[PDB]
Amino acid sequence: HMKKLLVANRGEIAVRVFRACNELGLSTVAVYAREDEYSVHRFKADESYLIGQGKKPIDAYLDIDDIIRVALESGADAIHPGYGLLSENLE
Amino acid sequence: TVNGFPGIENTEKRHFEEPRQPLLNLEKKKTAKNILDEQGADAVVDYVKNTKEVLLTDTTLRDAHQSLLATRLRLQDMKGIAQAIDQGLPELFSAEMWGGATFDVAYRFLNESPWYRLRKLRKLMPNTMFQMLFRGSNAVGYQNYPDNVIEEFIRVAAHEGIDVFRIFDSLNWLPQMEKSIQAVRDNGKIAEATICYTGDILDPSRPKYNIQYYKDLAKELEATGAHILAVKDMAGLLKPQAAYRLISELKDTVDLPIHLHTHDTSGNGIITYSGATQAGVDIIDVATASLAGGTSQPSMQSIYYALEHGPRHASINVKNAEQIDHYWEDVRKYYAPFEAGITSPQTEVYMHEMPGGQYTNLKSQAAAVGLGHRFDEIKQMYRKVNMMFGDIIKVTPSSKVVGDMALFMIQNDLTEEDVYARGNELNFPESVVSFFRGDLGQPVGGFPEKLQKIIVKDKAVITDRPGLHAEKVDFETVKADLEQKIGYEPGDHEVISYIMYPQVFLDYQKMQREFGAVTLLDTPTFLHGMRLNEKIEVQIEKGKTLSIRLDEIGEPDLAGNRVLFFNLNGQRREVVINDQSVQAQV
Amino acid sequence: AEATICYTGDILDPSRPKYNIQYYKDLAKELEATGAHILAVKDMAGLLKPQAAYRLISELKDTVDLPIHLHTHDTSGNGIITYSGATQAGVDIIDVATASLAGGTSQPSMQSIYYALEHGPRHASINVKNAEQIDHYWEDVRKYYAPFEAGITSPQTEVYMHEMPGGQYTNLKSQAAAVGLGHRFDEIKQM
Ligand SMILES: *C(=O)CCCC[C@@H]1SC[C@@H]2NC(=O)N[C@@H]21
Ligand SMILES: [Mg+2]
Ligand SMILES: [Mn+2]
Ligand SMILES: [Mn+2]
């Protein structure tokens, strides 16, 4: 069973999935770039982790391996991509 | 930010670069902690006895910063390098990270639980044995405690990760040690019975502490079943020829492995360690190079090259130790307000025999009073008061008695025959009368009988163990009272800390309810607050990092309150804090 | 006249064979060929380990009959044990400083080398009670030279790594921070 979910997105949609997960009784993991350090979605989750260190922030949010590494090391069971960045990404 | 750290002078917050992480050459090896966990204490003792090399105990985490940084080293700088110490130096016998003044000082000044520090270090150092300094019948406090308190502390400390207990008495008295030794043995850990070396064994003018005294004391310490015999040189008094002779006569007397702990106060620590190594010592207490020398221990990097091509080498990875010393050098610069005086080899410690921590604490205490300009007179009075008391062992807390007594002597212009004459009406300090009443135990050769009746006039003295006369403490009612006091059910460690330090633990709880876990902050931020337009990140949890920016410090109003404009997690938050310098109600 | 051999490398390490024991033996023979009165051994960077100190002095004592003068620094924190190792090998004169101006890049202490060699085969010819009384003056005088203090000094076994003498350590670190390389002074020491 799922106990923890990571959102591989930012901004409004990340907060929306966080609210849905909290209504469903799930732990929430946020990911954020360095340039998105003051985003609301970073502080709306139980755990927040910096991703894409050194890259452009949009490229940081498109980093598949870093997001998967954060989700694996945080104990997250699922990844919600939101929309836009990697929601339709097959890889 | 507005009021400064209490006890130090308010500077600006200096810019500090990140400390250098070590580049380690890891070598997977079986440590003594693994042998203790799998096979017990006796197999550890056999492993020490079967090692031809001299083992090293790292005193960086307790004694090096107790001597040099006024034991103000915090858990953040410890945990920045604890994993690197555990992995890069598996050759260490143990790491002394607890006990002594650390337990009181962390609660009092650092506002962090020593139990929390022990838990974090144990999680970060799984393969390194943890050594504590056990002060006999008064385990970490100064007042005497009942036996059930001592065994409860030993049980909880052994459960939370302490593996080696260096048990010593302030006056080298076996009744104040053997109960703690038995409790440590019962808890499955290693008991380190300790002799406090004082005087000179090669000086015929002082035969009170000669080689036969240490021989018979080591015999009775081996009779109690303690695993390792320890020799604590508190003030760096062990001369190298004296070290060789003492270690030889202790090696041909008992079968226990010998542990030597000395200070480099006279500048002869390295040669003393080498002379003990030639005589057949097993473990020696060393520190990292950046926190070595002066009142601290000799360097482990120096003691590697001191025995590099001799008959016995030191078991350490000196490249990894030199790499870790870069981090220690970088993080020493955070504690500039707590730095002691300019270091030098001080051979005058052979005269007054002051322990280094006692030396700096008494220097600060005498600097608080306007009398502190004649510190040479204070040291001479310390030497003569020690001679007048009957040449007692001057370690914590008996060294405090000698220091307070001598400071009282030259504070009111007293003399030895003068204090003999006027001692009927003199109001001596509480430490001297409590020592002469027998609350610290029975000294070797007894008290001076005329001076005893002069010091304590009407109060009852005791010649037996003070732990026999201690008031009984029941843990259930203490736990209930503490739960009433702190608002939640306390652990065994919290109750144990409440028993020995009642007001200190409660004030720590008040500081925890007011300021939270300040141990998670970095040391420059902990000591100097926050700068204007500064950005700090505070990790309060795994995955939770507080982004704090100080935007503007407001002017104080008529009530003395200042509004600080913080940017907490991207949002503006105005914090109202009272300025102590600004007078209120104006 | 004190003919002086400057010491570098490690005589007890076979990976550095240029300055081995035979090089110092031949140099001591060449210096004794001249009319030098005392052979001097300068350890400017404190590189002489105590096991190497016993080996080098004993191999020079049976090579030449000149008295051996040893001078070293305790930058590595091993100055006292190096002098005690050479005392066992039969060194004649050692270079010591007063206790208030000892340690670090300076010489090992005169007051501490007495107690190190006390009750041994050879004592140190000094009045340590008079030396400790003199050291009170140097402790007070050193307070006048606060602007010229090096800083917080610890035993540094990295002097075995880069072999920088103590005078060169303070001087070169001053220029690196002056030009702007003080933060990379570790990489300067590496190279
Ligand atoms: C930045 O790359 C985040 C995605 C923002 C654009 C995407 S494209 C499809 C979604 N529709 C929309 O209006 N925005 C989303
Ligand atoms: Mg051994
Ligand atoms: Mn000590
Ligand atoms: Mn020189």
Author numbering:
A (entry chain A): 0 to 90
B (entry chain C): 472 to 1057
C (entry chain B): 662 to 852
What do the study's own words say?
PC is mostly found as tetramers of four identical subunits, with monomers of ~120–130 kDa in size. This enzyme possesses a tetrahedral geometry with the tetramer organized in two layers.
The BC-lid is closed grabbing the MgATP where the adenine of ATP interacts with the main chain of Lys200 and Ile202, and the side chains of Glu199 and Lys157. The polyphosphate chain interacts with the amino group of Lys116, the Mg2+ ion, and residues 161-164 in the T-loop. This Mg2+ also coordinates the carboxylate groups of Glu274 and Glu286. Bicarbonate is placed between side chains of Arg290 and Glu294, and the main chain of Val293. In our cryoEM map for BCreact state biotin is placed in a catalytic position very similar to the one described previously using free biotin.
